[PDB]
């Protein structure tokens, strides 16, 4: 009726409310693990960076981007899409590796050719060395990453616990390592092919960290979003409730009119 | 053999006795596919 | 208290004698079955010499076909309970004056028991059809039909009828007339004029729900949406003691059922383990009454989370075995629960040990 | 109902011993402050506390008038009231009781309220004393009036409620005011029809009620007795 | 100073004597050791902070005494004891496995790791 | 209970529970999809779907309504067939292999037809 | 514009042309699957190829159904 | 002009003489107070001897408790405003025909001033209670329930009542009875039969902002849903010139503050900064008018 | 049809479809966001929000009441204006510009005004 269709739509909103409620809480649980990983990783990353800073390492081009397979992590996908696109105006001829289905789709719309490598299975778990290692190994072989004296990777840095700013860093090539000024103040040896190993090693070490930052933002965004959803659903609940109440009253009135009509005739 | 592969195998090996907890197993046992792309074009997704 | 032999009703929704409490639910889900179960557990009490324990039950079958009522009569006889029963019959075809006055006349019978100091239980099923009959009468008497074309002073009728149910004082002799009106709903529309009125008059409600039925609880009760407004003053002290805990665990279980469908904190998951086992334990099938000396142990186990270990499927096996094991180990203890009517700390100590032993084998 | 002169020209705050009441929902002289939040917040005990407070406060009395009483609940109230000595048989009884069961015919259900009110006005006018008159469900007051209207043949107005709903309530809630002598004040219980405040019977009730004190069961569960939830309790007497 | 860390830990991220197995054989670092860059091989490592000594089996990584005298050790996963008997049985099988099956090189690394384990 | 056979009752209790969960899960699947759905839930979806089309049974009358003559299934056969499904003895069997089938022979037969 | 979910013909294909009975045999089934999938798709859940086969087929069907005023055929 | 003393009701909902313009909103949100403030402001020309800008104001209290009216009167006498005003009263207790006849009689007094060519004002609080009163009689005459059971000839009643307010010509002495009819929304419902009938008859509404009201401010006005049309040509030029479509500007703010769950261009941010600050500027406490 | 031009009829048809989609997804967009719906849909939505705003045309007899001077737009002008918008040519300039103004040219000019 009016009454039942109102009621059913209100129930739909209710179920949506329940789901968004469930999701935001579960997301928070998952988020705790996400942040923990990112901490330990960032400490590790810092030890590597300690060398590169002091080294003054100094940077076609590669573009790597990071999102999960999974969506429902707000505007992670599209803030990232915009910042990729910005550096795809810096060089549209850049070979794009899209690590994540969601960024793949949006980015595919802006340019589809530029997509060269892509990865499926990301969203299923928090970033791990095993994943990073395999992607890196494949990244080197297929995309010949070392040739490009510019690699830049994009991910979402979770700036504050309610925000995310898509962020980038440049992956230091063997070329960068060569021309870093301090590298002799560290005693390099001719008894090792440190560029050919170190490039690979920081390809992954940087990648894993970038992923961890991105992942943390992903689960964080899901919580934030699912919370905002619940509020909006509450408001629609209120709007349909007033309509429901009104429809009850009107039905009562029409029934009474019927009774009166019957007596009157 | 490539250095990142070398370290990877080494990590997998390190995941072997009784002390080997699930989270360790997960950090070095994950399955995926790499959906290679090309210029639209797309060499098929094959297990990573 | 009045005991129905259904653990959930007796503990979660504690009922007494004199009290009027609603049974609002959808027909043929064993609406009649829930009612009948009480009479059968009351057979036990009936055996008990005192006539405050001899509840001479009255079933008021309103608008019910003779074929169905024939089954009811036979069922009462089968469970040998039709000998303190009275079945007032106003069938589907039986005329609307008879239907209208059927609860009223029936109540007068009830007053005789109450007056004699005895106790009895009158279960009006369904006063909704009593209402309908009054609608027929009123409309034909040209007296205006109230809301939903159901007389407005149907409220007045219900109030007169339902307020004759009383637990008397020793002034008029302490006797009683328990009542349990049954109201039939077609969607659980408490909004509907006839439910709103009855809901107001009754003290407590039992809200029996379809979702549970599908989920295998047959007869099916949603006991989150059941309430008592006469409370545990009409509850055995023993049964009260070991079932406060149960209410709280189940309360958490409802909320934490809304995250049940994956990855969950241990606290939430723990609640689910106890709660799922408890849900299975609170399942009951038609015409099985269960003694208080066996109500008290079962809730204790769940409370102590002893059910958690024994698999969900194995709850069924656990129950019968546990009870027999308790009887073998100490039907002295069981007899103490029944006779003392109270749970001494030593008896619960022993009971806890017994349950642990039973969980072991 | 009294003349303009013998109606409240300026309103003053009738004192209570409860700090929570005197801050977060100050009671008015002549005013109707309609309690919300049923027994479970210790509503009855709260009401009892008020009777004692009124006695200290002014010298007042009370009359608990119960409309659509459940005869079980009436028993409980009488027994509790005796025990807590607001009715001390040997001692003094401040509160006078008028109980009107649902079973009592709709006409008598409508008139229990007016009878209670007459006692109160005798207290105010003819014993000077301020009194506080509890009413139970004014929804069941409405229901009783609605029924009698239909019996009288009068066409049910919207949602079925009587056409004379406003005027009858108008009389009842204008015989509760501040005369030169005392003032009646009335604390009422509003059994909202499934929180469908939109309906005329609650809407009209809220139209008459100056303030509402909204006791919560959440609040009492935070161990707070007074069980008043001040983020729900709202008064116009907080000015 | 000295850092030793995993992306999952922060082992020693100070330490007084460190014994490391590196591209250049084995290297030991004690107090002021001139700043180095050595790629860490999968390793049996001894770390001593004071006379207290902790023994690590390490996946390989990178070692860098900084000009900050912070010996940044970065590795993916290490303690020594966790890596260690069922592994001996497994590794024995893995040695066999090289016979059956990039895969040849991989299986060789499994054997290499078995040598590193054997060294303990 | 044993009014219609104890086994018959138990089989039918299991069927109803399975369907009821699937109906609830429609909401979860609607937004979340496979997210917050366990291995167990996917199986419950699949069993419910298999049961869902197990209800479908031809009608004799069907000529221009379907054109597939009715299937009259023995009482014993119906009890057996639903039991098998629930036990997961027919959980390697497609959803559509219960579609418009009768007895146990039929459930297997339409499974065979899809199989080959 | 027709809402064919609430449209029925309870006389079946006996009132339908024989040629048209054969051709539109699975037209109903395809459409039924299209309607279901399309609803699901709006709750923004990620879609597998089996659902998107339906959806893609379904869209073509939707355009096929459309009628423009005053055109017999 | 009619100087309400509120910027928002004299340039965001501008008005002047003869106007019909309801004040609509939620029950007993100090509904009376909004109208009262206008009456209080008019003491500059009402205690003024300028008879044109002097109003002779009638406050019609229908369905109002006699106690509440007495408090209002005492409030009026504190603001010494009682003297230049008449009060017509038909309390809640007072009989249903009396309530029905209360506005019509009041308008007769209003016309005596008007037909002396003088400016007056009449505030009818509340016509919704007149609907309830008329309903009682009609039903008791067995006349059929109208829409929402409020009689169908309630429409005729209000339409005759409302149109007896208007500025009149040089022939008629340049007089006015400026109405301001204060309609109570039962349950906050604004789709209700009685409000919509009033809205169609009147020009302008004074829809009030409940959310903001909860968040204080006696009074908090939903100017987004308040309108005026012919009150905007009954203005005073000073407040027409200075009012440089500030209603529009603050419904650029209405839009801006609608969306934020969203990037804000620096221009939108500037609008918002003005808008929010402007809202603060709007806030005014009862019994004090600018 | 071509009663008032097939092209005119085509443009109007498209406006209706777009708006109907736009109204349809108002629930989901509000509860969630527009980003949790497709990019294609987002273009449609963005186009439709503009169309909605564009439909304004100040009244020339309530020009006093509104304050804003009215706008009168020719039928010939209308076909041109909507045609452009449907192709999203002017979907790049402020929705503030679109709001409360008449003609397509006026929108463009107000875009320049806003830009200052």
Curated annotation (Swiss-Prot), chain A:
Describe, as the record does, how this protein assembles with itself and its partners: F-type ATPases have 2 components, CF(1) - the catalytic core - and CF(0) - the membrane proton channel. CF(1) has five subunits: alpha(3), beta(3), gamma(1), delta(1), epsilon(1). CF(0) has three main subunits: a, b and c.
Cross-referenced PANTHER family, in alphabetical order? ATP SYNTHASE GAMMA CHAIN (PTHR11693), ATP SYNTHASE SUBUNIT GAMMA, MITOCHONDRIAL (PTHR11693:SF22)
Q: What is the effect of changing residue 229 to V?
A: Lower activity
This chain belongs to the protein called ATP synthase subunit gamma, mitochondrial
Keywords recorded for this protein, A-Z: ATP synthesis, CF(1), Hydrogen ion transport, Ion transport, Membrane, Mitochondrion, Mitochondrion inner membrane, Transit peptide, Transport
Q: Which CDD domains does the entry link to? A: F1-ATPase_gamma
The record gives the effect of mutating residue 163 to I as: In strain: D273-10B/A1
Which gene name does the record give?
A: ATP3
Curated annotation (Swiss-Prot), chain B:
What this chain does, per the record?
Mitochondrial membrane ATP synthase (F(1)F(0) ATP synthase or Complex V) produces ATP from ADP in the presence of a proton gradient across the membrane which is generated by electron transport complexes of the respiratory chain. F-type ATPases consist of two structural domains, F(1) - containing the extramembraneous catalytic core, and F(0) - containing the membrane proton channel, linked together by a central stalk and a peripheral stalk. During catalysis, ATP synthesis in the catalytic domain of F(1) is coupled via a rotary mechanism of the central stalk subunits to proton translocation.
| An MF annotation (GO) of this entry | proton-transporting ATP synthase activity, rotational mechanism
Q: What else is known?
A: Present with 4280 molecules/cell in log phase SD medium.
Q: Which domain of life is it from?
A: Eukaryota
* Organism in which the protein naturally occurs: Saccharomyces cerevisiae (strain ATCC 204508 / S288c) (Baker's yeast)
Q: Where is it mostly found? A: mitochondrion
Note whether Hydrolase occurs among the keywords. no
Q: One Pfam family from the UniProt entry?
A: ATP-synt_Eps
Coiled-coil blocks = none
Name used for this protein in its record:
ATP synthase subunit epsilon, mitochondrial
**GO biological process annotation, one example:** proton motive force-driven mitochondrial ATP synthesis
> Would you identify the family this protein belongs to, as annotated?
Belongs to the eukaryotic ATPase epsilon family.
Keywords of the record, alphabetical order, are: ATP synthesis, CF(1), Hydrogen ion transport, Ion transport, Membrane, Mitochondrion, Mitochondrion inner membrane, Phosphoprotein, Transport
Segments crossing the lipid bilayer: none
Which cellular component terms (GO) are annotated to the entry? mitochondrial inner membrane; mitochondrion; proton-transporting ATP synthase complex
Instruction: List the subcellular locations.
Output: Mitochondrion; Mitochondrion inner membrane
Swiss-Prot record, chain E:
Query: GO annotations under biological process?
Result: proton motive force-driven ATP synthesis
Cell compartments where the protein resides = Mitochondrion; Mitochondrion inner membrane
Q: What's in the GO CC field?
A: mitochondrial inner membrane; mitochondrion; proton-transporting ATP synthase complex
Chief place of localization: mitochondrion
| GO MF annotations, alphabetized | proton-transporting ATP synthase activity, rotational mechanism
Q: Which domain of life is it from?
A: Eukaryota
Q: Which UniProt keywords apply?
A: ATP synthesis, CF(1), Hydrogen ion transport, Ion transport, Membrane, Mitochondrion, Mitochondrion inner membrane, Transit peptide, Transport
- What does the annotation say about its assembly with partners? F-type ATPases have 2 components, CF(1) - the catalytic core - and CF(0) - the membrane proton channel. CF(1) has five subunits: alpha(3), beta(3), gamma(1), delta(1), epsilon(1). CF(0) has three main subunits: a, b and c.
Q: Which family does it belong to?
A: Belongs to the ATPase epsilon chain family.
Query: What is this protein's record name?
Result: ATP synthase subunit delta, mitochondrial
Gene source species: Saccharomyces cerevisiae (strain ATCC 204508 / S288c) (Baker's yeast)
Which gene is transcribed and translated to give this protein? ATP16
Which start and end residues of the full protein are shown? 33 to 158 of 160
Curated annotation (Swiss-Prot), chain H:
Q: Which GO terms describe its biological process?
A: proton motive force-driven ATP synthesis
Query: Principal place where this protein is found?
Result: mitochondrion
Residues annotated as site: Required for activity: 226
Instruction: Specify first residue, last residue and whole-protein length for the fragment.
Output: 182 to 473 of 545
Q: What is this protein called?
A: ATP synthase subunit alpha, mitochondrial
UniProt source species: Saccharomyces cerevisiae (strain ATCC 204508 / S288c) (Baker's yeast)
A Gene Ontology term for the protein's cellular component:
mitochondrion
**What are the entry keywords?**
ATP synthesis, ATP-binding, CF(1), Hydrogen ion transport, Ion transport, Membrane, Mitochondrion, Mitochondrion inner membrane, Nucleotide-binding, Phosphoprotein, Transit peptide, Transport
Give the top-rank taxon of the lineage listed in the UniProt record for this protein. Eukaryota
Give the encoding gene's name: ATP1
Q: Would you indicate the residue range of the signal peptide?
A: none
């Amino acid at each position: 009726a009016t009454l039942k269709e109102v009621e059913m739509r209100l129930k739909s909103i209710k179920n949506i409310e329940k789901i968004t409620k469930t999701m935001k809480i579960v997301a928070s649980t998952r988020l705790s693990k996400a942040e923990k990983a990112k901490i330990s990783a960032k400490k590790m990353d810092e030890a590597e960076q300690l060398f590169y800073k002091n080294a003054e390492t100094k940077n076609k081009e590669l573009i790597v981007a990071i999102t999960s397979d999974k969506g429902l992590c707000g505007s992670i996908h599209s803030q990232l899409a915009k910042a990729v696109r910005r550096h795809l105006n810096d060089q549209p001829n850049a070979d794009i590796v899209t690590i994540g289905d969601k960024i793949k789709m949006q980015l595919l719309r802006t340019h589809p050719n530029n997509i060269k490598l892509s990865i499926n299975g990301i969203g299923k778990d928090a970033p791990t060395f095993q994943e990073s290692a395999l992607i890196a190994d494949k990244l080197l072989s297929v995309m010949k990453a070392g040739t490009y004296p510019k690699i830049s990777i994009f991910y979402n840095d979770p700036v504050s616990s309610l925000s995310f700013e898509p962020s980038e860093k440049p992956i230091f090539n063997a070329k960068t390592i060569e021309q870093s000024p301090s590298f002799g103040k560290f005693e390099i040896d001719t008894d090792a092919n440190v560029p050919r190993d170190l490039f690979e090693y920081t390809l992954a070490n940087q990648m894993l960290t970038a992923m961890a930052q991105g992942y943390a933002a992903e689960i964080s965004a899901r919580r934030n979003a699912m919370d905002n959803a619940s509020k909006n659903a509450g408001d629609m609940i209120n709007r349909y409730s007033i309509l429901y109440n009104r429809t009850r009253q009107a039905v009562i009135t029409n029934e009474l009119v019927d009774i009166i009509t019957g007596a009157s005739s | 053999i490539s250095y990142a592969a070398y370290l990877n195998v080494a990590a997998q090996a390190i995941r072997s006795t009784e002390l080997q907890t699930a989270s360790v197993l997960n950090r070095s046992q994950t399955d995926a596919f790499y959906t290679q792309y090309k210029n639209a074009s797309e060499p098929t997704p094959i297990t990573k | 208290p009045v005991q129905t032999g259904l653990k959930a009703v007796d503990a979660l929704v504690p009922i007494g004698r004199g009290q009027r409490e609603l049974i609002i639910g959808d027909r043929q889900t064993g609406k009649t079955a829930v009612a009948l179960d009480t009479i059968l557990n009351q057979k036990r009490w009936n055996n008990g010499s005192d006539e405050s324990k001899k509840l001479y039950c009255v079933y008021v079958a309103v608008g019910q076909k003779r074929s169905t009522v024939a089954q009811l009569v036979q069922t009462l006889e089968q469970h040998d309970a039709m000998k303190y029963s009275i079945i007032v019959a106003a069938t589907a075809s039986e005329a609307a004056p008879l239907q209208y006055l059927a609860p009223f006349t029936a109540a007068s019978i009830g007053e005789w028991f109450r007056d004699n100091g005895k106790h009895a239980l009158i279960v009006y099923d369904d006063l909704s059809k009593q209402a309908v009959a009054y609608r027929q009468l009123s409309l034909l008497l040209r007296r205006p039909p109230g809301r939903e074309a159901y007389p407005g002073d149907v409220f007045y009728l219900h109030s007169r009828l339902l307020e004759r149910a009383a637990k008397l004082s020793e002034k008029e002799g302490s006797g009683s007339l328990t009542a349990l009106p049954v109201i039939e709903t077609q969607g659980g529309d408490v909004s509907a004029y006839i439910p709103t009125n009855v809901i107001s008059i009754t003290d407590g409600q039992i809200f029996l729900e379809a979702e549970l039925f599908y989920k295998g609880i047959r007869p099916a009760i949603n006991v989150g949406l059941s309430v008592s407004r006469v409370g545990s003053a009409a509850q055995v002290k023993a049964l009260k003691q070991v079932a406060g805990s149960l209410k709280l665990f189940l309360a958490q279980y409802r909320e934490v059922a809304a995250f049940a469908q994956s990855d969950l904190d241990a606290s939430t998951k723990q609640t689910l383990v106890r709660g799922e086992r408890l849900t299975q334990l609170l399942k009951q099938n038609q015409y099985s009454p269960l003694a208080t000396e066996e109500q008290v142990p079962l809730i204790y186990a769940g409370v102590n989370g002893h059910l958690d270990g024994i698999e969900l499927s194995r709850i069924g096996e656990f129950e019968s075995s546990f009870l027999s094991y308790l009887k073998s180990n100490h039907n002295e203890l069981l007899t103490e629960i029944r006779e003392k009517g109270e749970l001494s700390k030593e008896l619960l100590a022993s009971l806890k040990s017994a349950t642990e032993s039973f969980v072991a084998t | 109902p009294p003349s303009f002169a013998e109606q409240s020209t300026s309103a003053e705050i009738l004192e209570t011993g409860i700090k929570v009441v005197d801050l977060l929902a100050p009671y008015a002289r002549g005013g109707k402050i309609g309690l919300f939040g049923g027994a479970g917040v210790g509503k009855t005990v709260f009401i009892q506390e008020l009777i004692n407070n009124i006695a200290k406060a002014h010298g007042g009395f009370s009359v608990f008038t119960g409309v659509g009483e459940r005869t079980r609940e009436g028993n409980d109230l009488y027994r509790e009231m005796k025990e807590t000595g607001v009715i001390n048989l040997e001692g003094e009884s401040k509160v006078a009781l008028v109980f009107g069961q649902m079973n009592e015919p709709p006409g008598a259900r409508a008139r229990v309220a007016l009878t209670g009110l007459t006692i109160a006005e005798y207290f105010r006018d003819e014993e000077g004393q301020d009194v506080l008159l509890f009413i139970d469900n004014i929804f069941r007051f409405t229901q009783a009036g609605s029924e009698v209207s239909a019996l009288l043949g009068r066409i049910p107005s919207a949602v079925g409620y009587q056409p004379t709903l406003a005027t009858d309530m108008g009389l009842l809630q204008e015989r509760i005011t501040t005369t030169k002598k005392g003032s009646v004040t009335s604390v009422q219980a509003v059994y909202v029809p499934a929180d469908d405040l939109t309906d005329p019977a609650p809407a009209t009730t809220f139209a008459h009620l100056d303030a509402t004190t909204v006791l919560s069961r959440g609040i009492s569960e935070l161990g707070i007795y007074p069980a008043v939830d001040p983020l729900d309790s709202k008064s116009r007497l907080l000015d | 100073k000295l850092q030793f860390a995993l992306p999952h830990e922060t082992l020693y991220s100070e330490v007084t004597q460190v014994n490391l197995p590196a591209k250049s054989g084995r290297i030991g670092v004690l107090a002021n050791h001139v700043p180095t860059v050595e790629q860490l091989l999968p390793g049996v490592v001894e770390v001593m902070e004071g006379s207290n000594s902790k023994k690590f089996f390490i996946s390989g990584g990178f070692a860098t005494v900084q000009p900050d005298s912070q010996l940044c050790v970065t590795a993916i996963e290490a303690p020594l004891e966790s890596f260690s008997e069922n592994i001996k049985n497994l590794l024995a099988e893995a040695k066999k496995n090289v016979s059956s099956s990039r895969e040849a090189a991989e299986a060789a690394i499994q054997v290499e790791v078995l040598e590193n384990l054997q060294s303990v | 209970a044993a009014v219609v056979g104890q086994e018959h009752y138990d089989v039918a209790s299991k069927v109803q529970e399975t369907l009821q969960t699937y109906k609830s899960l429609q909401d979860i699947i609607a937004i979340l999809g496979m997210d917050e759905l366990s291995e167990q839930d996917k199986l419950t979806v699949e069993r419910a779907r298999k049961i869902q089309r197990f209800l479908s049974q031809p009608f004799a009358v069907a000529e221009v309504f379907t054109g597939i003559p009715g299937k009259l299934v023995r009482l014993k056969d119906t009890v057996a067939s639903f039991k098998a499904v629930l036990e997961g003895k027919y959980d390697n069997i497609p959803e559509h292999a219960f579609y418009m089938v009768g007895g146990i022979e039929d459930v297997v037969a339409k499974a065979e037809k899809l199989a080959a | 514009a027709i809402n064919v979910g609430l449209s029925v013909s309870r006389v079946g294909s006996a009132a339908q042309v024989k040629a048209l009975k054969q051709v539109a045999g699975s037209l109903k089934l395809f459409l039924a699957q299209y309607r279901e999938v399309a609803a699901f798709a709006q709750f923004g859940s990620d879609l597998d190829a089996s659902t998107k086969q339906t959806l893609v087929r379904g869209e073509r069907l939707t355009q096929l159904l459309k009628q423009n005023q005053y055109s017999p055929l």
